[PDB]
Swiss-Prot record, chains A, B:
Functional note: S-layer protein. The S-layer is a paracrystalline mono-layered assembly of proteins which coat the surface of the cell.
Domain of life of the source: Archaea
Localization annotation: Secreted, Cell wall, S-layer; Cell membrane
Protein name, per record: Major S-layer protein
Residues of the full protein shown: 319 to 592 of 671
Amino acid sequence: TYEIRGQVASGFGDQSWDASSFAGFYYDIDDNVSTETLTVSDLDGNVIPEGGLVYTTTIADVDFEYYNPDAGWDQYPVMGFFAEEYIPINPDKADKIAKLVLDSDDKYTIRTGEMLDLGEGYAIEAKQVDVDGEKVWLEFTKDGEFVDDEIISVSTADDEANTWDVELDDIEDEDDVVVLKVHVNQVFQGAVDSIAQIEGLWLIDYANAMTIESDDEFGNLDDVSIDGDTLKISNEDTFTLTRDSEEEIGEGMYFMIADTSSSDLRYYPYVEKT
Amino acid sequence: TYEIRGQVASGFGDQSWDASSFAGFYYDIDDNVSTETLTVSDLDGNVIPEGGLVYTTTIADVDFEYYNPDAGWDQYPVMGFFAEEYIPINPDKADKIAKLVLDSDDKYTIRTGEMLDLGEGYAIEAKQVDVDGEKVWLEFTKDGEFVDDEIISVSTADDEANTWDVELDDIEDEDDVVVLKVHVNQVFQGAVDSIAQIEGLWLIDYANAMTIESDDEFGNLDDVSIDGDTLKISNEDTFTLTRDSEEEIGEGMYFMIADTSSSDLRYYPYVEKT
Ligand SMILES: [N+]
Ligand SMILES: [N+]
């Protein structure tokens, strides 16, 4: 394990950390986007009152790596969750999340009958190309099991026709959840081989999606509030910034508090990772 | 390996990072001390001119963990060097450094004839206690070899009499180098056993001490300047903040530069560790 620290706080005033002052928080440089804050308020000496320690994360959006709004590739939602990146499976709800497997703009060729492994048990197969070489029949699988299939027409006027979005139901009680996007550039119909050329892939590990429950507790951050696109997690009871010590906030986040006299206070937050 | 990022820089103006804005730099919370800065100056578009990229580290001082100025335990020198802590072996010179092995205020008892292993091949032995139980004969060793010895009187008026400082010569061309401090609280003369009680230990790995040479080069930071207590390391040639990329500065430090149009510039430094 290793440690990533934030800016140092001094004195007994209110304090605030975000991505710019705490390198542990998630941050996307291309879109210049982050989601997390940690605040300390209303200290009495070194004791934070109930509700004075607040971790907040609010959904934000970033450009697909394969950026092409006209073909249906504009932005997707992102959310920091205890210093890790997650994808909200419904872009308006902060409490249902999954890990991103792929966000890619690399070119791949799939030959009919062959599988492109996407990672974590997910794959796409070109099952067939049509005689005229303008349509490809794709199939999406998880651990060898059928999930979905679609016929994609690759040389129409409409650039969105090249994109396949897999929408699944009953994922953490959400329906119409986009779990995979695949953009097919073209099809190549050779003498012996036909191949599909892919460029643009986005996949979340929907099979491992989770829900943050109102009853969940994260160490001393044990008052979870879910308000649409924002999680706000707060302390139910007093929290002491014990001098000359480390104190868990929760779920891998900590404060380091300096060895000073009780007339002073100096501390910074940090995150522990592996 | 893992990554620790600093604050984001935007635009074509001059920029500066220190410990408060770059969590990769060394920082001591108890003494509130750091030593490192990284600056970017005089950009022409995304090209830093010769001398425009400067890494500086200046020796600072911290309290011994066993803090007791009267017994000779006040402060020792520290220096960040490419995000790692080093001890300058001469507190006025930034170019001769060693790693800290121990900075301790824990109590230990050593029985006569027994060895306290200090780490990294170093040990101290209580060889004998005197009949009156007011003096202990200590010996310092490295990989079993004799380095130094001293008779310490533990119940005099002078509190500095309890401290043994080992001073060695010919370490990276420095003489009178304090490599070990040992503070003996007291001696206990039992019926069968006599033991020495230690509290206060400080050790640097002097055997692996190194010198930063004027001719040394650290990737693209290849102009080393040594000025007493300060190392200033600079770029001899142009350095491009290539957009949508990572670029090595040197010795584990990098810039991450955002994918933007050439009308903009956004980047942050980071350090790679293992
Ligand atoms: N919800
Ligand atoms: N020097």
